[PDB]
């Protein structure tokens, strides 16, 4: 998705703050859509990282954020 404020902030703010926000947004989508995947998503955020998802989540209107679950876990 594209959100002007979150795009700019995620590109520039303190890593820890940005990762907290990305993780919260991902976990909200997980809870809404596929709540059974919560722990699996968390494992992959820990092993694979969090920051990389800023662009698809906030800086790209061509990405539908519902697809972030598959983006993280692969299904």
């Amino acid at each position: 998705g594209y959100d002007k404020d979150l795009c700019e902030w995620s590109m520039t703010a303190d890593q820890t703050e940005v990762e907290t926000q990305i993780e919260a947004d991902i976990m909200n989508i997980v809870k809404r859509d596929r709540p059974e995947m919560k722990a699996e998503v968390q494992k992959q955020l820990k092993s694979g990282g969090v920051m990389q998802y800023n662009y698809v989540l906030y800086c790209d209107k061509n990405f539908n954020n519902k697809n972030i679950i598959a983006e993280v876990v692969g299904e």
């Binding site: 703010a13 303190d14 694979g48 990282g49 920051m51 990389q52 800023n54 662009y55 698809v56 692969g74």
Partner: protein
């Protein structure tokens, strides 16, 4: 069967902004290495001292980096990316293990290999012996299975899933490219 895409409508810049994200200030990767831009590794050491990081980044960018965390512009992120992409694309073609595979496969499968090399280096891709052997033989199912039988797949499963799907199918439908 499943169609291949010999001229996929996606650039590596697009693919890697998606997979690597986009930062205009320093962050640290999962190995603790200072990074910026689109997966631009500033130093291959787990340095946290921003004065040191900024001095190195200043040389790479060409002007004095300020701030903590240090900051670059979008133009500078683009310039760094173009160079990193050029380096990887040259080296993936020449390496004696990965290169012959790259030469033999279609552009979609090349992008899969390039994506891996941007993540782990050309030398990292070269460790996928079984996968690369299978690709050179056209045994896409064996290559797919080998790629998923890896620490890479367990640690970055989402990215490895969509990349291995390219290896299997020869198209970029796993990245939304019809």
């Amino acid at each position: 069967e499943i169609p291949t895409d010999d001229n996929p409508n996606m650039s590596m810049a697009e693919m890697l902004r998606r997979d690597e994200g986009l930062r205009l200030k320093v962050y640290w990767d999962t190995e603790g290495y200072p990074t910026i831009g689109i997966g631009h590794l500033i130093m291959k050491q787990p340095v946290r001292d921003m004065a040191q990081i900024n001095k190195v980044l200043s040389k790479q960018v060409g002007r004095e980096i300020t701030g903590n965390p240090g900051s670059i512009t979008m133009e500078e992120a683009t310039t760094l990316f173009e160079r990193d992409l050029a380096d990887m694309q040259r080296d993936i073609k020449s390496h004696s293990k990965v290169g012959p595979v790259w030469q033999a496969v279609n552009r979609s499968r090349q992008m899969a290999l390039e994506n891996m090399a941007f993540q782990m280096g050309v030398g990292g891709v070269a460790k996928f012996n079984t996968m690369l052997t299978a690709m050179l033989a056209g045994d896409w199912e064996k290559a797919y299975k080998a790629g998923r039988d890896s620490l890479w797949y367990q640690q970055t499963k989402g990215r490895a899933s969509r990349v291995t799907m390219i290896i299997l199918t020869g198209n970029l439908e796993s990245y939304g490219v019809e």
